[PDB]
Structure formats: C-alpha cells, structure tokens
Design a protein around this ligand. Structure first.
Ligand SMILES: Cc1ncc(COP(=O)(O)O)c(CN[C@@H](CCO)C(=O)O)c1O
Ligand SMILES: Cc1ncc(COP(=O)(O)O)c(CN[C@@H](CCO)C(=O)O)c1O
Lengths: 394, 394
C-alpha cells in the first residue's frame, strides 16, 4: 500500500527540477563501447567521466577471452561460490591476484561493492571496533554498518585523530582500520606509512580498498601497499575489477587463514551468485596485459601529467589529487549542474559532485584520464571547458 | 597488525575438521558449463544443486547474444549507472522487465544481493519500520540493517504475528513488509493474499523478492504477485538474473515515482558499477525465451512433480515445498556432511544445510530440478541417494 511510502519520497524534487530546467545528465544512455569517445543520441562525446584508467574494455584480446569463456562455460554459474558456483577459472584468478598483490590467498566477490561488505561485516563483532577514514567509499561505510561492531570515523587522513580515537578504546577488543588507497573524490592517497605505524602500535588490523589504485600506482600497478613498500603492514588488500581491470567483480587478498574465515563467513560471498565466466576471463586477461605491457600505465600517467599541467596553466582550481582523477572546483551546485550539461551538449562527458554529497562551496566536476586518451582529445575537452566556465561565469 | 584478528578467527575450526576428515565439499571447482552434468576433477557429476531452473546458461542463443554484446560494447561499462555506466541496452532491459511483471518502471542492479540492499536501505528511515519474515534471504536482512529504520522480524508465514507487530507501531510512521516469494530453504510460498490484506489495513508498503519465483511461478513465469493475481497489492517486485535468467544482476520494479527515488538514492546503484554488456544481453535473450517457449517452464514442473513423487515413494522426509526445490531432511549435521560428500564421490551434486544456519535436527540436503534434467538422470540420482542414505544409516 502506498500512502506513507508516497509521503517518504514526496520531498525528493531535485530530479524533477533538473529535468524541467533541461539540466538533467544522470543515467545518460551510451550506445557504444566505453572508450575515449562514446555515442549518446547518435552523436560522439569525449569521455572524461570513466574509471577505465587503462582503456582496456575495448582490448580485442580481453573481448575474445570473455567470448571464449562464454563458449566453454556459458552465461552464468547459477549459484554461490560456496555451493555450485565455483569454476576452475575463479580459483585461477584468485591465485593470480594473490601473486600480483603479494598475499597468500584471495576470495572473489561478484562486485567491488560486495568485496567491501564481506570482511567489514564479519571480522570485527560485538565489543570490537572499526575505524574508518571519514571519506571512505560508501561500500566501506555500508560494510562496517553490517558488522556488529562499533564504527568510528576519523578525520580525512588525520593520523592525530586516528591515534586519539584508538587510544580511547579498551585493550581487550579487536580493532580494524579500513581506508581507501586512492580516494576517488579528490584523487588523494592515504598516509599509509603513518596509518600502519599507528595500527602496529595498537595491534589493529589494516584493510586498504585499492579500487582506484590497481593498474594506477604500485609496481606494475599492484596498488597502494606496493606503492609504499608496506605489503607486510597491510592485513587485507581489497580491489575491484570494474576500473583498470575493465570487468565486474572484486576480491580481498590476505593471509590464508583470514581468507579461509572470510570465504566461509561473509554473507556477500555465501549468499550471492559467483562472477560470470566472461567477467573471470576478462579480469584474468586484463591482469596479464597490465603486467606484461608497461606502456598502459606509462601512457595513463603521461596523459594525467599533461592534462593536470594544462588545467593549472588555464587557471582551473584543482583538488589535491595524486592520481588520474583531476577534481575541478566550481563551488556552486547550480553552476556544477549547468557546466555539466553544457559540456555534455558540446560533446564532453564529465561527472558532477554536488550537495548533499559535498558542501555547495566544494561542488566540482571530476575529469578522469584513460591511457587511451590522446593529447588532442585532452586539448579539445579543456578548450570546451574554458568556454563553458566563461559562459557559466565560474 | 594481526594479534587480535588472529584471535577473532581462532575458534572457526569446522572447515579444518571437514577437510581433515575428507568430508569438505564447499567451493567444488567445476571445469565445465553449469548443466545437468558438470565436470569436477575430470569426472562427470549429476547437478541437482543449481538455481538454473530452466537450464538456460547453455542456450547457444543466449551465449551468442552475450558474445555479440561483448563485440559491440566491450567487457564493462567502468562506472555507476548514475554516471557513465548506463547503456541503451540497460534501459531496454528495464522497459522489458517492467512489462513482464506489470509495473511502470524498473532499475537494474549488478547483483541480486544489491537489488535488495537498494530499496531496503533508503525508503524507510528514522521513526519508520521494516517488517521481515524471519526466513527472509540474508540480502533482505542486510538491506534492512543498512536502513535507519527499526527492523522487526515476524514468524515464518505467521500472519497473526505480522498483524500483531504492525498493530503495536505508531500510526504516524511509514512501514514496509519485505518477504521472499518462494523461500529457498524449504521451497514454500509466502501467504501473499493475507500479507497484502494486512498491508492494506495498515497502509504498509509491500516488497516481494522473486529470486526463486521468476521463470518458476506466475503467468509465463512473471512471479509471485502474478501467481496470486495481486500485482495491484505489491509496491515493489524484486528479482535476480542469476537463477532462471541464467545471468548475473537483478532489478526492482514498481511505480515510476518510487523507482525514480530508488535509482537516485540507493547506495548500491549510485556507488557500484553497472551490469556488464554480456549480462544485459544474456538476461534480455533469456527473458524472451522464457515467454516465447512455454516448454521450459512446463518441463521444469514435469521434472519437479516426477522427482517429488519418486522421493516420497522411496520414503524420504521432504520439506513443505511448493517449488522445484526438494528439501530432503537428514536431521544430523554429521550425517548431512557425510551424505553430501558420499553423493559427490558417487557423481551426485546436492547442497547441504547445517548448523548454525538450521538446528541439527532440521539439517537437510537441497535437491533442485532444472527443465533440462531427464527422468533417467533423476532416477540415477535418487538410486544413488537411497544407497548413500542406507550407508550413512539415516
Ligand atoms: C531470495 C534471494 N534473494 C536474493 C539473492 C541474491 O541474488 P544473487 O546476488 O543474484 O545471488 C538470493 C541468492 N540465492 C543464492 C546465491 C546465488 O544466487 C543463495 O543464497 O545461496 C536469494 O536466494
Ligand atoms: C573506492 C571504491 N571501492 C569500491 C567500489 C565499489 O566497486 P564496484 O562495485 O566494482 O563499482 C567503488 C565504486 N566506485 C564507483 C562505482 C563504479 O565502480 C563510484 O562510487 O561511483 C569505489 O570507488
């Protein structure tokens, strides 16, 4: 019945207002492969709003691997990994990932999102604590909310606040610190040396979410622990396959005993169907290419360094990024919606960040690089961005 | 750091003990397509542990649809639906699903699991209530735990308990009842007529999780509301693509205003990558076949009715199933593990249900039918089950 339900949703008017003003640009229907140009409403649009950092969703070898796995294994496994949903190729990908990030063992999940729900829900329990950077991904706050532990946020990369909040807790309790490796909003890197120093002092477990780090930082893209040389101070490396790895799903890697506990206790792996064969095979073939072909990571960073330099030279106000995410400040929700739509209509795709996710005065567009971007594409997008910022009086 | 973490996982010994006894049969690595026979360790095994109720993960038309979508769209969309992750084919599948289940609108999620997290986390809030059947799927309890509402369980299909618990709540609050349509443990159907009667009396929203219902009950498999004629009394129809639909992902369908709220407020769709093109195309092509080819559902039910009759004739103690799930009671955890492994070693795959998920005295194996099973396969599996039950002294 819908009386109270209708009242619950009644005050959500922003989408109605965006659509009526001709500003709405969510769920834009793409007609073509995710690439540096995408087709929307039959017209070409430059894509600077993607997480495919190495451009690999169009790699014909990765497409063929997926198509061959469909031929051999069909369209789905129709069960949890736990029961009838494990293939030899899931185990192969777990062994490959473990080697890549330098851990004993891994367990796959069918999404990145569920890869955080798993360890955050089932390791810390009653009388235990989870310590979260206040900017952690939504999936980390949700995972932590599914635990029976007490969840404590600390100031963004604030090691004094992390240390202070740990020092307050009972000794006879378990603690886990979970952080994004690269934080996607501003593109900044966790202070992993100080966080792990503090974790070592308080015997707290450390988990790093490397969604935006894999294929981006660390040796051959192996992530944030790899970037800092701190493999031995990180208990759990979590990653996703939806970004550099051009696919769908994720994993948690760590010590064999911890991963054995996880794979038999995490509701998001016991009670959800396993990755499709096609996604296993695309992830396996992408992981080979990231390691075998250093040019992908090199070109990503040459694009990043070029675009960042060009944006700062044209006088854009950038966030404190250390990554291929170039956050461009606008500091008005209205102007952020206007700039986003005007760029869309001029053939540039960027992502808006607005209230209530950030303060009005911190509203921004996110401009992300792919290895497959050309300097010509970057220049065309920045040319169009300068024009639209002028038109919008930012 | 690992001191407290090592202590947290220290008492979990069942997996160690199962493996040391030679009884362990979780995460069995399959080497072949999910089908009525699967290859494990190079030997053929009859599959009675699947959720592919219509056997469609091997349908060459569905494989070809997935392979063609890989060719056209690549391996992944590399973003949320919200941002850069929507394709024309996602929208097509939403329109198709809406028509199938007789609702205005749908939103896809990248798993069934996340399809429950979405509406249960964001519709009921502070001062509101969610009413859950005590046997609801784990994803429904987790979704409900992610809301800021008060979550109340009622007795399994106990309408007196549901009515009593609703009658206690403040009038000036919103309420949502969420139930499995077909409950997977015992294979029983929700009392949707009485539950919706009560929801109408208390103006409570109704959500039905049709994971095990789609392709199984209702007109041309359209699910539990369709089965009872109660489309107009159910606010939200949730389904999964991982079972009959042979794929990965899920959806929530309902009124356009509710679904518009969902797609812009549910963290599991805003902050998780969209379904792979291959999974969209396999789901679309499976949905066409379920409707166009009535023989699949017919054969599923002829297998179900045959196997159930044969099992009751051989004197097995079955659960109160109304579905292709035949729960076979064993009532000893030790015997449930032994029977499961002995059947595996004799070429029969079934799923154990044991403590702590059920009482020892309710431990059982789940025997699920597929449309593609033959009577000869069913007879061979039951022959082997009679032998193993004898050997195990059940
Ligand atoms: C009623 C209901 N609702 C939702 C789900 C989650 O859907 P999934 O994420 O597609 O697996 C399941 C998942 N069932 C299987 C997992 C494989 O689908 C299980 O619990 O073993 C379910 O039974
Ligand atoms: C740090 C981190 N951790 C986990 C996730 C979830 O991974 P996903 O389920 O593969 O999308 C994301 C998802 N990021 C995108 C969604 C598409 O990947 C977003 O929040 O818009 C993330 O940024």
């Amino acid at each position: 019945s819908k009386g109270k339900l209708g009242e619950k949703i009644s005050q959500f008017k922003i989408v109605e207002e965006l659509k009526a003003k001709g500003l709405y640009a969510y769920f834009r229907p793409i007609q073509s492969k995710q690439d540096t140009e995408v087709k929307i409403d039959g017209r070409r649009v430059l894509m600077f709003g993607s997480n495919s950092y190495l451009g690999l969703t169009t790699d014909t070898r990765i497409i063929k691997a997926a198509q061959d796995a469909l031929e051999k294994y069909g369209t789905g496994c129709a069960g949890s990994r736990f029961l009838n949903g494990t293939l030899d190729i899931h185990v192969e990908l777990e062994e490959k990932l473990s080697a890549y990030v330098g851990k004993e063992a891994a367990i796959l999940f069918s999404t990145g999102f569920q890869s955080n729900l798993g360890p955050l829900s089932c390791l810390m329990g009653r009388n235990d604590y989870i310590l979260l950077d206040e900017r952690d991904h939504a999936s980390i706050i949700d995972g932590s909310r599914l635990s029976f532990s007490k969840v404590i946020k600390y100031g963004h990369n604030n090691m004094e606040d992390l240390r202070a909040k740990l020092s307050r807790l009972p000794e006879d309790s378990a603690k886990l610190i979970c952080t994004d490796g690269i934080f996607s909003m501003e593109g900044d890197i966790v202070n992993l040396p100080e966080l792990t120093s503090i974790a070592n002092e308080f015997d707290a477990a450390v988990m790093v979410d490397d969604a935006h780090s894999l294929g981006v930082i660390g040796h051959k893209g192996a992530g944030t622990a790899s970037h800092f040389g701190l493999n031995d101070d990180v208990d759990l490396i979590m990653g996703t396959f939806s970004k550099s790895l051009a696919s769908l799903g994720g994993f948690v890697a760590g010590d064999a005993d911890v991963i054995d506990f996880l794979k038999h206790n995490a509701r998001s792996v016991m009670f959800s169907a396993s990755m499709t064969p096609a996604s296993v095979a695309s992830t396996l073939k992408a992981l080979e290419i990231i390691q075998n072909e250093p040019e992908h990571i090199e070109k990503l960073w040459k694009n990043t360094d070029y675009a960042k330099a060009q944006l700062l030279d044209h006088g854009f106000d950038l966030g404190a990024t250390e990554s291929p995410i170039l956050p461009i400040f606008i500091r008005s929700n209205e102007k952020t919606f206007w700039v986003t739509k005007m760029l869309q209509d001029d053939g540039v795709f960027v992502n808006p960040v607005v209230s209530p996710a950030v303060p009005a005065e911190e509203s921004l567009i996110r401009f992300s690089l792919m290895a497959t971007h050309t300097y010509d594409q970057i220049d065309e997008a920045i040319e169009k961005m300068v024009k639209v910022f002028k038109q919008a009086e930012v």
